[PDB]
Curated annotation (Swiss-Prot):
Post-translational modification (record): Ubiquitinated at 'Lys-48' and 'Lys-63' by RNF146 when auto-poly-ADP-ribosylated; this leads to degradation. Deubiquitinated by USP25; leading to stabilization.
Role summary: Poly-ADP-ribosyltransferase involved in various processes such as Wnt signaling pathway, telomere length and vesicle trafficking. Acts as an activator of the Wnt signaling pathway by mediating poly-ADP-ribosylation of AXIN1 and AXIN2, 2 key components of the beta-catenin destruction complex: poly-ADP-ribosylated target proteins are recognized by RNF146, which mediates their ubiquitination and subsequent degradation. Also mediates poly-ADP-ribosylation of BLZF1 and CASC3, followed by recruitment of RNF146 and subsequent ubiquitination.
Lineage, uppermost ranks: Eukaryota, Metazoa, Chordata, Craniata, Vertebrata
Residues the entry annotates as binding Zn(2+): 120, 123, 128, 131
The name this protein goes by in its record: Poly [ADP-ribose] polymerase tankyrase-2
Tissue specificity of this protein: Highly expressed in placenta, skeletal muscle, liver, brain, kidney, heart, thymus, spinal cord, lung, peripheral blood leukocytes, pancreas, lymph nodes, spleen, prostate, testis, ovary, small intestine, colon, mammary gland, breast and breast carcinoma, and in common-type meningioma. Highly expressed in fetal liver, heart and brain.
């Protein structure tokens, strides 16, 4: 499957060297991709496309849809129930929203919790090369995205906007991040099962 090869390439090619020296997500340059599953949840897809059409109509017939990563210990609840802003990241740089990265390694830092939590459930290792990790590769409707550089605790998107784009800056973000404030503005399209690999 070329669809799956495209997802593996997005995963591999978006890895970056993290400022924390791998404290949160581990030390690696690449992954061992074990499985890529397409999520087909008709109810979630209908909620997503219904919202995507509304946002498109409010944004000059353009949804501004992107494929983005999301790492979380709650990936299995997300696949069944969808992203839920009632469980949004309050402590987040851009307030109470649902957060995504365009770099797979940034999302990998959240797979076991904030700052990688205590790592894998079995070895309590944030850099575990044994335990199988899971990330989501999502369809996200950004619509009219508010470009922001510094911390801005929002409860909802700014007036006239459908999302917030956190752009990198000198005394700010190392890498981009994308925030939606409505769970129906993202669809968890692919569930990726993988391992981070020990460097060569
Ligand atoms: O957006 C968050 C969230 C994000 C984060 C940070 C984060 N988590 N994952 C990322 O991939 C990421 C990428 C760039 C910047 C930050 C992140 C932390 C706690 C959170 F609750 N959600 C929590 C998990 N979600 C749910 O619907 C849970 C299942 C009930 C979706 C929304
Ligand atoms: Zn482990």
């Amino acid at each position: 499957d070329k669809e799956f090869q495209s997802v593996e390439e997005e995963m591999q090619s978006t890895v970056r060297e993290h400022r924390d020296g791998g404290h949160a997500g581990g030390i690696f340059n690449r992954y061992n991709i074990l499985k890529i599953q397409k999520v087909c949840n008709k109810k979630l897809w209908e909620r997503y496309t219904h919202r995507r059409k509304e946002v498109s109509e409010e944004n000059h017939n353009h949804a501004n849809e992107r494929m983005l990563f999301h790492g979380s210990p709650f990936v299995n609840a997300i696949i069944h129930k969808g992203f839920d802003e009632r469980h949004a990241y309050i402590g987040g740089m851009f307030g109470a929203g649902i957060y995504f990265a365009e770099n797979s390694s940034k999302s990998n830092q959240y797979v076991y919790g904030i700052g990688g939590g205590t790592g894998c459930p079995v070895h309590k290792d944030r850099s575990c090369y044994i335990c199988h990790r899971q990330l989501l590769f999502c369809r996200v409707t950004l619509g009219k995205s508010f470009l922001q550089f510094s911390a801005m605790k929002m409860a909802h998107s700014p007036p006239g906007h459908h999302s917030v784009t956190g752009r990198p800056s000198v005394n700010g973000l190392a890498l981009a991040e994308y925030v939606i404030y409505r769970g129906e503005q993202a669809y968890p399209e692919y569930l990726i099962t993988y391992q981070i690999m020990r460097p060569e």
